[PDB]
Amino acid sequence: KRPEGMHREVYALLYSDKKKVRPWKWMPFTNPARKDGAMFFHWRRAAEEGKDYPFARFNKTVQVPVYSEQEYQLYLHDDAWTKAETDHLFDLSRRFDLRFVVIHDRYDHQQFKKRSVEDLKERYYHICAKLANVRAVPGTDLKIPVFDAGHERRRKEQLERLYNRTPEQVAEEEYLLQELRKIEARKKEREKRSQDLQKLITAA
Amino acid sequence: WLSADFAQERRWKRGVARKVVRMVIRHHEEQRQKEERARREEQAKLRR
Amino acid sequence: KRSRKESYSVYVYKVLKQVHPDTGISSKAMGIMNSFVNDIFERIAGEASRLAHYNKRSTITSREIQTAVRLLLPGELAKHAVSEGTKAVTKYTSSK
Amino acid sequence: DDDIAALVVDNGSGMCKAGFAGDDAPRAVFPSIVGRPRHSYVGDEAQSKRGILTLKYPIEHGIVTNWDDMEKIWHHTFYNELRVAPEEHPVLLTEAPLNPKANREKMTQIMFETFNTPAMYVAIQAVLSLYASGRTTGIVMDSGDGVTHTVPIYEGYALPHAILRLDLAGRDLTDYLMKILTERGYSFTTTAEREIVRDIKEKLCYVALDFEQEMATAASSSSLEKSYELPDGQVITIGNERFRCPEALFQPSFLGMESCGIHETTFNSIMKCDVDIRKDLYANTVLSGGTTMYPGIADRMQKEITALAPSTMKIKIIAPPERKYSVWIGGSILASLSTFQQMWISKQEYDESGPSIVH
Amino acid sequence: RAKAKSRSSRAGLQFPVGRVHRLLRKGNYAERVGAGAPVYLAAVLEYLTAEILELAGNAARDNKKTRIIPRHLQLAIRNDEELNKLLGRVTIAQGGVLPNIQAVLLPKKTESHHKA
Amino acid sequence: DEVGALVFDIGSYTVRAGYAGEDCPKVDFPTAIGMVVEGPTYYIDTNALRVPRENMEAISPLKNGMVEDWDSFQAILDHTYKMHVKSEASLHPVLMSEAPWNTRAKREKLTELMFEHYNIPAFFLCKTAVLTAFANGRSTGLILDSGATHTTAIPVHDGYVLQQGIVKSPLAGDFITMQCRELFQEMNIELVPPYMIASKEAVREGSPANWKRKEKLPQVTRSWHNYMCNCVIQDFQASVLQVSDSTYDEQVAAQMPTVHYEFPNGYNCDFGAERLKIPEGLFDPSNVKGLSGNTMLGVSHVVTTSVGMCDIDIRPGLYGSVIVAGGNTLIQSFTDRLNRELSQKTPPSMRLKLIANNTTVERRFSSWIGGSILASLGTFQQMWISKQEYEEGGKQCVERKCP
Ligand SMILES: Nc1ncnc2c1ncn2[C@@H]1O[C@H](COP(=O)(O)OP(=O)(O)OP(=O)(O)O)[C@@H](O)[C@H]1O
Ligand SMILES: Nc1ncnc2c1ncn2[C@@H]1O[C@H](COP(=O)(O)OP(=O)(O)OP(=O)(O)O)[C@@H](O)[C@H]1O
């Protein structure tokens, strides 16, 4: 007699073709990423009461250099910049992860004269390059690729000119766009073809 | 990571709420359909 | 106003990546693979339809497809497909 | 199949609606109190010894603590539910109007730990009460003992931004009654007799329909002295309390603690909801809680919401005739449900995540 | 409602069981297709595709290439004993037949020193 | 990562308080709490404020999105802590939102006020724009918040606000309320709040309201009466007002279907082009009576100005992430008009993109949801202002841990 006893489809296919004891508890914990020893709380398991906080690894601070007063007075002296004017830049860099698009806004324009983004970045990179050049053993990337602030300035200016284009530099600019191809084709197809046809007529 | 999770979780929570509401509506409708089917079961018992 | 056309490029690239993580596939190779998929689809479907029709049956069932796979695939190739299909059906009816 | 095994609980501060789920009524209840020596009991024993024990309410207007008081409440509920866990026990517990994190996380953790339940769940009383009837949205009054919920539960979700509450549901109303008495006839002056006091409202709970009639109920001077009888047999001919403190619920100023009346409270609650959703809020107003039996509350709510609500929207009342335990009825309808099995929390997801689950 | 689960995920297949059953039900292959027919068909298609893709990737790695091309597919189909039997009638675009080695020319004849 | 905390979103219109990790705030009540000088008594519950009694002069503890009454601020905080929260502040860290233009003096006074009075374990003061960007799935982008007091476009770059790019306009909920007041006064509509109505009878459209005044009236102030009237006006706004798809055209405005609305006193009438001429002032304040002045910047103008004052290197990203939030943004067709105006103004190169969050919860509670997901991150645990940090570094610690 047919054994079956299982699902119809599977059966036909096969034959027709022969206590928990882990309590969660409210636990305090100290985050190694902090220096003040602030004690926080977390919903942890009982098997790991006391283990280090795992997210502490996500605390890699930016590499903003630190230098002494003597080093500054000796090498980083600048007629246009004073210590009160320079230390604030590095403070903002250390505080905002060394991004100059936010540091410029944070610049205290009350006590300090107005500075652009490009000149602030240039001063920072120049200070870094000087600190490196006055260092030999620590290998602080002696050959830093300091950007050209003037090229950066003119780039910021030309693209800003390309920004505001409402009246005719965005709509009528289609004319100059078509001209970009016309002049690259009409000028050639006229003058070079004139030369070619003159040579042909000479041969003819 | 957490914002995508929160958005998906809000959507899934609203979906589950819709599910449970439709399910209780189905429970009531099926209770009445079960009264009707008890009448039909009286008929089917006559038939048997 | 779009005229979208379908293809198996989505399940073949997935299969390729699950069996060959580092090796890709070109567009024309993908089209050839899709053509092979469609051809085997047609062959198996026609074989199952004809097999069901021989037994005066109006429904193509998993058993018909299983015997069609036994018939079409040659030598030591059918057995593997039949086993895969059976293990997928058993794992499908088990509600996993 | 948690359906056939379902368990439900609704403790609050009024009455512990607990026991095995599957039927359309609570298997057994107790007044949800615990007592200890003055210089341990729970349930009916605590209610019997209220005159000699140090009674405390493990539920305080929604706040709950489960280490001894609510743990003893649950240990007594063990008598209402089935016996030792492995028999039958999918457990959903009593959540407050809005205390989601603090209540849910700790309650779930400690209940799982104590009762070792392979199954459990948590949800707010509002949705489980709305499930008693089943419709798009509800503005359930849920006037129980310690809370008067205004929950606008649209599509089964308790919108917290629009959630409001009032505090004149239980012990406040009974105290206002006890102090209105002894100004008009007999009374008592201690919590040991507040039960026999509320036993006056458990039989005579006709409402005055103030602000539309406002004088005729008492001016009739006839067919209003039902003369509730005390254990001795006194016939003092219960008077204006026949019309006083049904309205204190709707007029908190009448008691002294002032706030939006229940009718206008719920009105504002739905006003805080979306403008496109509030349509079905008027036409699907539900009433829940023991304090809502009060046969006259239906017409009072109709009249007041009509006075406040626009004319274009009609006030459709669907208050169940047995709204006494509307919470328990819908909660069991939800729990006792075959297709609801896939939404319970078990050992697996507990161990993988813990009580820090979505809640 | 409950979170909808596809039929390809239940069985554990990558190819579309849904689209397979779709092509079948309105493909006139039968009157009322069974619930298991499409699952089995998709499983067999997936297995065959996985095998041919394995062979094509092996051929590509042997040829030191990353993108599979008709060359690799043809080589794989004609090298395997059973796939060639299954695809004997088939021809592939931009494909080729198995080649021969030219090393045989060297030790028979080459250019002599005459005016080299 | 997730610790029992309380995210406070103290908006000028409503304050939202709840636990970190939730999808919605635990409580949401109007910020214009009523006050009675009895110390002074404050009511922080909708059922305890909109009540026919208790003069409750509206003190509005904050104004212009900044704290202006520290005593009323303490009172509202206390009430929020023991009315719906019902928990000791010392057991829950506090993440509170702040207006970008909030001064440092305030920031520090608020910080110290939450350590010597409430003794909270940790503190953090994040800007509303940062939280909004955090919630909508963007670290860089422009935050357009059209609140009750002001409509502001706050450019956020890398999770930090660019102050120089902040643009504010007084065309906000207050302006809409004023315009609705003017419209009602022009149409001979008596704005009768609910608390003054005893009963009413249905009347025909446009006919005088047939309502009875309560005899035992409350002793309300002009402030509380105006507050009730403003609540009614805001209901009218949410029910009727609709932004014009294109620039307001009177001829096209007279071809739109009317919207029916019944005031609390029973007066009901259909509104035609008057409901679409009010919301036009937000985008085009030129055609506004009594607003004679062109310095006022519309929503699209505010956005374009805020993006123009920023470095061009980030303007593409700003246009690619323009998050719209606020209560006023819930007005019908507001998003479409804004997107159309921005597409017409935004240069072609700049890919304009408007995040598709438009739900009431998603819009009004964006600032709170941001902090809710920000305080639930394990990475945020290292940024808290701990009690020790405040005790050692003082009140000025707010400027370093949460600039
Ligand atoms: N037979 C009855 N008739 C009229 N009123 C009753 C009757 N029985 C109880 N009540 C009233 O109902 C109240 C009981 O409140 P209930 O048990 O519904 O509170 P709860 O909703 O469970 O608690 P919470 O408010 O915390 O949710 C009592 O205060 C009592 O006055
Ligand atoms: N449903 C609605 N439809 C249309 N407009 C509405 C609606 N609800 C509220 N508003 C308007 O939105 C305004 C409230 O703005 P909102 O509270 O969102 O700002 P906010 O988040 O408090 O701003 P801030 O955080 O800067 O204080 C009110 O003045 C009201 O006119």
Coordinates of N, CA, C and O in Angstrom, one line a residue, chain D residues 60 63 98-101 157 160-161 164-165 258-260 264-265 268 272 274-275 278 307 309-312, chain F residues 2 19-20 22 24-26 28 45-47 50-53 84 86 200 235 238-239 260 262 360-361 365:
Chain D
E60 N -0.5 54.2 39.4 CA -0.6 55.5 39.9 C -1.0 56.4 38.7 O 0.0 57.0 38.1
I63 N 1.3 55.3 35.9 CA 2.7 54.9 36.2 C 2.6 53.6 37.0 O 1.7 53.4 37.9
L98 N 0.0 57.1 27.9 CA 1.3 57.4 27.2 C 2.4 57.4 28.2 O 2.7 58.4 28.9
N99 N 3.1 56.3 28.4 CA 4.4 56.2 29.1 C 5.2 55.1 28.4 O 5.7 54.2 29.0
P100 N 5.3 55.2 27.1 CA 5.8 54.0 26.3 C 7.1 53.4 26.7 O 7.1 52.2 27.1
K101 N 8.2 54.2 26.7 CA 9.5 53.6 26.9 C 9.6 53.1 28.4 O 9.8 51.9 28.6
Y157 N -3.7 53.3 15.3 CA -2.4 53.9 15.8 C -2.7 55.0 16.8 O -3.4 56.0 16.4
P160 N 0.3 60.1 19.3 CA 0.7 60.8 20.5 C 0.6 62.3 20.5 O 0.4 62.9 21.5
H161 N 0.8 62.9 19.3 CA 0.8 64.4 19.3 C -0.5 64.9 19.6 O -0.6 66.0 20.2
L164 N -4.5 63.6 24.5 CA -4.7 64.4 25.8 C -5.3 63.5 26.8 O -5.6 62.3 26.6
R165 N -5.5 64.1 28.0 CA -6.1 63.3 29.1 C -6.7 64.2 30.1 O -6.4 65.4 30.2
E258 N -9.9 72.1 38.1 CA -10.5 72.7 36.8 C -9.7 72.2 35.6 O -8.5 72.0 35.7
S259 N -10.4 71.9 34.6 CA -9.9 71.5 33.3 C -11.0 71.4 32.3 O -12.2 71.5 32.6
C260 N -10.6 71.2 31.0 CA -11.7 71.0 30.0 C -12.6 69.9 30.3 O -12.1 68.8 30.7
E264 N -15.7 68.6 25.8 CA -14.8 69.6 25.2 C -13.3 69.1 25.3 O -12.5 69.5 24.4
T265 N -13.0 68.3 26.2 CA -11.6 67.7 26.2 C -11.4 66.8 25.0 O -10.4 67.0 24.3
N268 N -11.3 69.1 21.8 CA -9.9 69.6 21.6 C -9.0 68.5 21.1 O -8.1 68.7 20.3
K272 N -6.8 68.8 17.7 CA -5.3 68.7 17.5 C -5.0 67.7 16.4 O -3.8 67.7 16.0
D274 N -5.3 65.9 12.5 CA -5.3 66.4 11.1 C -6.6 66.9 10.7 O -7.7 66.4 11.2
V275 N -6.7 67.8 9.8 CA -7.9 68.4 9.3 C -8.7 67.5 8.4 O -9.9 67.5 8.4
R278 N -10.1 64.3 10.8 CA -11.1 64.6 11.8 C -12.5 64.3 11.4 O -13.4 64.3 12.2
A307 N -22.8 70.8 19.9 CA -22.7 72.2 20.2 C -21.3 72.7 19.8 O -21.2 73.8 19.2
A309 N -18.9 70.9 17.8 CA -18.6 70.4 16.4 C -19.3 71.2 15.4 O -20.4 71.8 15.6
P310 N -18.8 71.3 14.1 CA -19.6 72.0 13.1 C -20.8 71.2 12.7 O -21.0 70.0 13.0
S311 N -21.8 71.9 12.1 CA -23.0 71.3 11.7 C -22.8 70.2 10.6 O -23.5 69.2 10.6
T312 N -21.9 70.4 9.7 CA -21.6 69.5 8.6 C -21.3 68.1 9.1 O -21.6 67.1 8.4
Chain F
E2 N 21.2 53.7 22.8 CA 19.9 54.2 23.2 C 19.8 54.2 24.8 O 19.8 53.1 25.4
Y19 N 10.8 60.7 24.5 CA 12.0 59.9 24.7 C 12.8 59.7 23.4 O 12.2 59.6 22.3
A20 N 14.1 59.7 23.5 CA 14.9 59.5 22.3 C 14.7 58.1 21.8 O 14.8 57.1 22.6
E22 N 12.0 57.4 19.7 CA 10.6 57.2 19.3 C 10.3 57.9 18.0 O 11.1 58.8 17.5
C24 N 7.5 59.6 17.3 CA 6.7 60.8 17.5 C 7.0 61.2 19.0 O 7.4 60.4 19.8
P25 N 6.8 62.5 19.2 CA 7.0 63.0 20.6 C 5.9 62.5 21.6 O 4.8 62.2 21.2
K26 N 6.3 62.4 22.8 CA 5.4 61.9 23.8 C 4.2 62.9 24.1 O 3.1 62.4 24.3
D28 N 2.6 67.0 23.0 CA 2.7 68.2 22.1 C 1.5 69.1 22.5 O 0.4 68.8 22.4
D45 N -1.2 72.2 29.5 CA -2.1 71.1 28.9 C -3.2 71.7 28.1 O -3.9 72.6 28.6
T46 N -3.4 71.2 26.9 CA -4.5 71.7 26.1 C -5.9 71.7 26.8 O -6.7 72.6 26.7
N47 N -6.1 70.7 27.6 CA -7.3 70.6 28.4 C -7.3 71.6 29.6 O -8.4 71.8 30.2
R50 N -7.1 75.8 27.1 CA -8.3 76.3 26.3 C -9.6 76.0 27.1 O -10.3 75.1 26.7
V51 N -9.8 76.7 28.2 CA -10.9 76.4 29.1 C -11.6 77.7 29.4 O -11.0 78.7 29.5
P52 N -12.9 77.6 29.5 CA -13.7 78.9 29.8 C -13.6 79.4 31.2 O -14.6 79.4 31.9
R53 N -12.4 79.8 31.7 CA -12.2 80.3 33.0 C -10.8 80.7 33.2 O -10.0 80.6 32.3
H84 N 3.3 64.8 31.8 CA 3.3 63.7 30.8 C 4.5 62.8 30.9 O 4.5 61.6 30.8
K86 N 6.6 62.6 33.8 CA 6.5 61.9 35.1 C 7.8 61.1 35.4 O 7.7 59.9 35.6
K200 N -25.9 76.9 19.7 CA -26.1 77.4 18.4 C -27.1 76.6 17.6 O -27.3 75.4 17.9
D235 N -7.4 77.2 12.9 CA -8.2 76.1 12.4 C -8.8 76.5 11.0 O -8.8 75.6 10.1
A238 N -6.0 75.9 8.5 CA -5.8 74.5 8.2 C -6.9 73.9 7.3 O -6.8 73.0 6.6
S239 N -8.1 74.5 7.5 CA -9.3 74.0 6.8 C -9.5 74.5 5.4 O -10.1 73.8 4.6
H260 N -16.1 75.2 1.9 CA -17.0 75.5 2.9 C -16.4 75.4 4.3 O -15.6 74.5 4.6
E262 N -17.5 76.4 8.6 CA -18.4 76.9 9.6 C -17.7 77.3 10.9 O -16.9 76.5 11.4
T360 N 2.1 65.6 8.3 CA 2.0 66.4 9.4 C 3.1 66.1 10.5 O 3.8 66.9 11.0
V361 N 3.2 64.8 10.8 CA 4.2 64.3 11.8 C 5.6 64.6 11.2 O 6.5 65.1 12.0
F365 N 7.0 68.0 13.3 CA 7.9 67.3 14.3 C 9.3 66.9 13.7 O 9.9 66.1 14.3

